[PDB]
Amino acid sequence: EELPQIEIVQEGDNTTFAKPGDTVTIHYDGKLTNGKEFDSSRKRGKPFTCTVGVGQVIKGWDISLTNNYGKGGANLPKISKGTKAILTIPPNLAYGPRGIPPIIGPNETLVFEVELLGVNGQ
Structure with a gap:
């Protein structure tokens, strides 16, 4: 299957x-x-x-x-908790062919910078 880049x-x-x-x-x-x-x-x-x-x-x-x-x-x-990462997510794992205009266009790849601050409130 297709996965995001982490x-x-x-x-x-x-x-x-x-x-x-x-x-x-x-x-x-x-x-x-x-x-x-x-x-x-x-x-x-x-x-x-x-x-x-x-x-x-x-x-x-x-x-x-x-x-x-x-x-x-x-x-x-x-x-894990306290981890910083960069997520690259293809259209199929994002908003797909239609996308969500005018917020996000069709067939769009998305890039995220994420930091996990907590799991189950701790």
Whole structure:
């Protein structure tokens, strides 16, 4: 299957990993491949909290934060608490062929800078 690109820029505690159903808290920056930013929790003023692995965020996010639903994968490093990463997510794992104009265009790849701040409120 097709997976997102995950590059660790800062290692976490290598102990606290999130799994489907868990609640996570992260800070993130979202930009198009042309460098143009489309979303950012840091600029909004608060970290984002959500349930991962159940499709309540884009599929690329669920995969990165739960290590492919616990299945893992080829070249798919784990993200623990305190980990900074860069997520590259293809259209099929983002907003697909139609996209969400005028917020995001069709057939669009997305690049995220994410920092895992907490798992299950801790």
